Nucleic acid binder design. Structure first.
Lengths: 223, 66, 155, 186, 180, 97, 125
RNA sequence: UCUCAAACUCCCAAUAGGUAAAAAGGGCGAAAUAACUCAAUUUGUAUUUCACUCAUAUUAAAUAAAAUAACUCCAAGUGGGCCAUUUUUGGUAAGCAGAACUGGCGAUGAGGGAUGCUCCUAACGCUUGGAUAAGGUGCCUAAAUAUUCGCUCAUGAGAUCCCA
RNA sequence: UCAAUUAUUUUUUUUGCUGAGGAAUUUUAAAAUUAUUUGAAUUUUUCUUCUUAUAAUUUAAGUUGUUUCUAUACAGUACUU
């Protein structure tokens, strides 16, 4: 037994050290990407040419609409998407297939691109995670690492910071990490919406569909 | 007395409730009506192979026994 | 009122413009093995072995072959349940399917690619790409070639 | 609100604890549940689950059938979650080691005479903790006569369900609707 | 800055092109300026124009560049002339109006307000075709000509208005419209 | 008894959750690197105005070339719009007569 | 509203009333669930005879506990008080309604010696 | 050359529908077995037995409170229905007659629509605090006699989906 | 003068409501913080970082404390209902 307690402490120390070095490497990566984008845009300005940034790869989708009176396909898509209760949020991996499914539920959902600060804040302050045995999960607020060091130990992406890193720019271990989080139960916005009645692009007050960048401002109000 | 004579309404809604059921997808199935000639030939083949296999197994067992 | 065998088949079973006249001779040669996938496409240059309306445009496994007949396992939606139905047709209407061939081609291509990769011990994502988002890029447009636009006045 | 299948309440099926009020059986389920909960062995859980089962599901087992099952490893102990019944078809028996719930009187006499061993479940647990070198068996289950009236309905094509009749002679349910001669066939 | 007098109409320069294919190696590149309540809205309006004028949709094309324009000298006056296409209840009309303002953005905000007031045009129903700053000698509408006079001055004659602090429910005597 | 697997221990009684952003201990416990990053941020922050105040002039001066180049890009953008207005005007003028 | 006292929260007071017992004499006052094709009460109309339901229930770690802070036990004989010496701090005796005054006195006296609270103490003297 | 067609058709969308996406399998080989096949004891078939070997450390495309699944039994009540959008046939039309898809209502409260079985919001254990929706913010009536630019005088103004 | 808006961050002025639980061996272990102690690092530091050892503590590991009052009462007009 005495060796086992000692050994456990060594494992605990190694994990914290390991996570720290990965964290630092991630932090270095983020700034490098951000700076490079600025430099590239300036380079494009300098010559005659345009740089274009990637399509954003992830999308945070917020549901907008009640349980009642929903078309049957739309209800099915919602179930797959994983937004049930009416203000639920989830990250979705942009592809072709996901985007089409998203298109079907479009008048019922706002969505957009996170930015790093938004992900970090949301994951700490409102992240819940699925703790229990297979398909009987039970909802636990994240709180500390030993929970996620269990499930994502195999995939080597344990550490809550590490979860932020995988999500923010789509890492290889995406499907598990997204699945593993419980759907975000969100609080309403401080200054309210404008109209669940219409699209954001309709020139009226209105909210549904793609909001690209501006989703973060909305998330910040309603966190 | 004049009373509405049809509608498919609500039937679909009932139907999806227990889901649209699938067949049970068995690997083998009865060959009863399927081609006389070919299947009788097969019955002979199975008997032949089985007889050879049985004779070999018996031979191993009796030989092992001594 | 009535609902007899060829009911409501007018345009469906009729041939397209310039496609009248007997089933081509070559078409009898096509190979059918057990468990091959097969479409059921009606004709009407042949009369024997013509299938009922529903099995038009459906596709299934071949489970039984006779002198000129082909048994086809077809799924039919009956209210709350799909059930399997054995449609006996004659060869003129049964057509060798292509949906299977996509998968089969993929298997062959994958096998070669995998064998080479594994030999080099170069780890590989053989599974289908399934088109991702567009990656970032840098694009030269000549500043003299660009055109600028406005919405048109009405007439 | 929210939308979930059965509003988020999971539905398990089958038994939940024994119905039987018999003290000995209550003692046995307590014991095996304890063995199940502590050990990780699948043997303990299955024995516990089968032990709870209702009267129709655990069948009586013939000695002859048991001998056929034990034949290729006759060193070891058969456990049978039912009652074992005797047979007059079976000529002789080669000293088996059997745990069963209940023994027919003649069978116990025969097994003992043959030099075999009759174990109760308490004894099986005590001697063997994880079912080590054991063989779980159970008898013909669907073969019960009642089940022959189940399945795709009697008189719906090909289906082999038994009808129900007052008596099985020629004037009872054997004319119109069961042959070519008198309306439709079976 | 005062939020109450704030507006959110900006100008965005958008550049886009068709996705390249075997048929089109180098496509015709399109740029436009579009007056919008945000950048996404700007994009959407640009896409609608792409569908209406050229042969393109969002799905088979790509954005080359998106950038905000903002006025160079926002505190000196300009006379902006605008030409619109709008739809009425009967049908469709072209029309030309002039606006005195401080930026293009201000001009469009007033114009939307005007079109709603005089013509019942909803934002959906307005299409901007060309807005440009016009010289004082070339002005065509009388109310703008009057402003452009040499020594503009006039008396104030608008009613008082004031903070919640003083807008109380009881007063010593009748206040005066007059002012000095 | 010998056969039985060792005793397992029951799930944990629910405390108040502790804030994952503003409780310093909790945050550090979650993220080990956070202490270093905060301290770095404080260390940068500490630095008084004199260095910044001299430097601002340098920042502006080295931006000048960029400023000219950018002025040209927007200048070109405007010219293109004016040209489009003239081209449409000729077209309309032709159409009218 | 909620009726807190110390460790004892009870959510609801005003004993639930059978609908219509206000305005017909025959209708008994103690509760009944309305059935009815359409009737207000089953249908949960605003401001009318709010139906009881289980979620109102007292907390499970304080379920039956008197403001005495001790569980009530009914006693009709001194022999029956033989257990409750070992729980004198947590159960309180009530002397049963039937019990005659001579016996009742004896029960009160035994309880006092045993150091257990007696709730209907002054009864029948 | 002017204009046309539920029961006309060179051509012809969207939506809806089907099949496809690998391990009880598939590969490429060998060897067996048969009264079948073929000219063919090896010409195939099909089965069977042996070999060799196919992705799997994200799972032979995604995504999934995807096994709360299958399946069996025994039995209930029900088999008068009705309304909205959209599609729609009869009828001058009808809060009329008849259909199609979906959602409701029925069996369903609560908040809003002044008022209302069906409209909008939203579906309900008991509570405390928070922040909103739908909708409002002169008073009745909780929020603005808010800000900002227009238009509007009516000797029967005008004022909120369904909806009067 | 030094904007405005994103970006990444770091605080602060008042303050509303809440306090389940009660750990005979996961109320620990670790985190954090303090006074020491050893070696590195680098933005070079009076909140510099890590990690070496020792003590303590709470930001950990769901509210505790002081003072009144009821009251020096015996049921009162307070308090329950």
């Amino acid at each position: 037994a005495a060796k086992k307690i000692k050994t456990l402490k060594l494992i605990n120390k190694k994990k914290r050290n390991d996570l720290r070095q990965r964290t630092l490497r991630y932090e270095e990566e983020y700034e490098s990407e951000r700076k490079k984008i600025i430099e590239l845009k300036r380079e494009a300005r300098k010559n005659n040419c345009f740089y274009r940034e990637a399509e954003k790869k992830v999308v945070f989708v917020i549901r907008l609409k009640g349980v009642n009176k929903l078309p049957p396909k739309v209800r099915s898509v919602f179930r797959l998407l994983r937004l049930l209760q009416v203000h639920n949020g989830v990250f979705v991996k942009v592809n072709k297939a996901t985007k089409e499914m998203l298109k079907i539920v479009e008048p019922y959902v706002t969505y957009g691109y996170p930015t790093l600060s938004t992900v970090r804040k949301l994951l700490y302050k409102r992240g819940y995670v699925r703790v229990g045995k297979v398909r009987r999960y039970a909802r636990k607020k994240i709180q500390d690492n030993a929970d996620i060091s269990k499930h994502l130990g195999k995939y080597n992406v344990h550490g809550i910071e590490d979860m932020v890193y995988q999500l923010y720019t789509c890492g290889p271990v995406f499907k598990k990490v997204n699945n593993f989080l419980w759907a975000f139960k969100l609080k309403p916005p401080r200054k309210g919406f404008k109209a669940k009645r219409h699209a954001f692009n309709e020139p009226r007050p209105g909210d549904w569909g793609n909001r690209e960048a501006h989703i973060n401002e909305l998330i910040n109000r309603m966190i | 007395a004049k009373s509405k004579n049809h509608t498919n309404h609500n039937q679909n809604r009932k139907a999806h409730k227990n889901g649209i059921k699938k067949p049970k997808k068995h690997k083998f199935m009865s060959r009863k009506g399927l081609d006389p000639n070919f299947f009788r030939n097969q019955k002979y083949c199975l008997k032949g192979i089985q007889k050879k296999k049985k004779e070999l197994k018996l031979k191993a067992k009796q030989e092992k026994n001594n | 009122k009535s609902r007899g065998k060829r009911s409501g088949t007018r345009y469906k079973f009729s041939k397209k413009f310039r496609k009248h006249g007997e089933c081509t001779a070559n078409k009898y040669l096509e190979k059918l093995n057990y468990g091959d996938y097969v479409d059921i496409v009606c004709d009407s240059t042949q009369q024997k072995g013509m299938p009922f309306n529903y099995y038009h445009g459906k596709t299934g496994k071949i489970f039984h072959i006779t002198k000129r007949g082909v048994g086809v396992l077809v799924n039919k939606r009956v209210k709350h349940r799909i059930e399997q139905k054995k449609v006996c047709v004659r060869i003129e209407h049964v057509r060798k399917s292509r949906c299977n061939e996509d998968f089969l081609l993929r298997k062959i291509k994958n096998a070669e690619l995998i064998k080479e990769a594994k030999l080099k011990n170069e780890h590989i994502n053989i599974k289908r790409k399934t088109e991702g988002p567009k990656p970032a890029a840098m694009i030269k447009v000549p500043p003299s070639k660009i055109i600028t636009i406005e919405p048109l006045p009405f007439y | 609100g929210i939308a979930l299948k059965n509003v988020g309440r999971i539905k398990k099926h089958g038994r939940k604890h024994l119905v039987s009020k018999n003290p000995y059986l209550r003692l046995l389920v307590k014991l095996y549940n304890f063995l199940a909960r502590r050990t990780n062995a699948n043997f303990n859980k299955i024995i516990a689950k089968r032990l709870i089962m209702p009267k129709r599901y655990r069948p009586p087992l013939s000695l002859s059938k048991l001998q056929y099952h034990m034949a290729n490893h006759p060193n070891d102990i058969a456990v049978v979650v039912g009652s074992i019944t005797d047979d007059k078809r079976l000529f002789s028996l080669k000293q088996l080691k059997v745990c069963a719930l209940r023994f027919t009187e003649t069978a116990r006499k025969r097994i003992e005479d043959a030099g075999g061993e009759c174990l109760t479940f308490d004894q099986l647990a005590l001697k063997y903790p994880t079912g080590k070198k054991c063989v779980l068996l159970r008898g013909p289950t669907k073969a019960r006569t009642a089940e022959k009236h189940f399945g795709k309905a009697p008189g719906k094509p090909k289906s082999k369900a038994r009808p129900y009749v007052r008596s099985k002679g020629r004037k009872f349910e054997k004319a119109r609707g069961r042959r070519k001669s008198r309306a439709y066939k079976k | 800055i005062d939020n109450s007098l704030n507006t959110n109409i900006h100008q965005y320069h958008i550049v886009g092109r068709a996705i390249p294919t075997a048929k089109d190696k180098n496509p015709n590149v399109y740029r436009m300026c579009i007056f919008a309540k945000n950048d996404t809205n700007a994009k959407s309006r640009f896409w609608y124009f792409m569908k209406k004028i050229n042969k393109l949709k969002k799905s088979n094309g790509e954005l080359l560049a998106c950038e905000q324009i903002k006025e160079r000298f926002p505190l000196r006056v300009k006379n902006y002339g605008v030409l619109l296409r709008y739809d009425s209840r009967t049908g469709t009309h072209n029309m030309y109006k002039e606006f005195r303002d401080t930026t293009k953005e201000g001009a469009i905000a007033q114009l939307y307000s005007e079109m709603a007031g005089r013509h019942r045009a909803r934002a959906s129903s307005i299409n901007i075709i060309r807005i440009s700053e016009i010289s004082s000698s070339l002005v065509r509408r009388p109310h703008i000509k009057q402003l452009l006079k040499r020594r503009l001055r006039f008396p104030a004659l608008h009613l008082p208005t004031l903070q919640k602090e003083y807008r109380k429910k009881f007063a010593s005597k009748r206040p005066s419209t007059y002012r000095m | 008894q010998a056969s039985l697997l060792a005793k397992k221990k029951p799930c944990k009684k629910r405390l108040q959750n502790k804030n994952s952003l503003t409780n310093f201990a909790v945050r550090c416990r979650l993220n080990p690197a956070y202490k270093l990053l905060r301290s770095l941020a404080v260390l940068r922050m500490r630095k008084s105005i004199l260095e910044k105040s001299k430097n601002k002039k340098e920042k502006r001066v080295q931006k000048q070339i960029q400023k000219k180049e950018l002025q040209k890009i927007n200048h070109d953008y405007y010219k293109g719009v004016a040209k489009a207005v003239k081209k449409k005007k000729k077209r309309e003028e032709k159409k009218a007569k | 509203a909620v009726k807190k006292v110390g460790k004892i929260i009870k959510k609801r007071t005003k004993k639930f009333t059978r609908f219509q017992s206000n305005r017909f004499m025959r209708v008994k006052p103690a509760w009944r669930k309305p059935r009815g094709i359409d009737c207000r009460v089953r249908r949960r109309y605003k401001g009318t005879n709010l139906m009881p339901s289980i979620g109102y229930g007292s907390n499970k770690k304080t379920k039956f506990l008197l403001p005495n802070n001790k569980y009530k036990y009914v006693v009709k004989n001194v022999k029956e008080m033989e257990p409750l010496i070992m729980n004198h701090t947590k159960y309180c005796v009530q002397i049963a309604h039937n019990v005659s005054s001579k016996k009742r006195k004896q029960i009160i006296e035994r309880a006092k010696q045993m150091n257990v609270s007696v709730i209907n103490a002054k009864a029948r003297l």
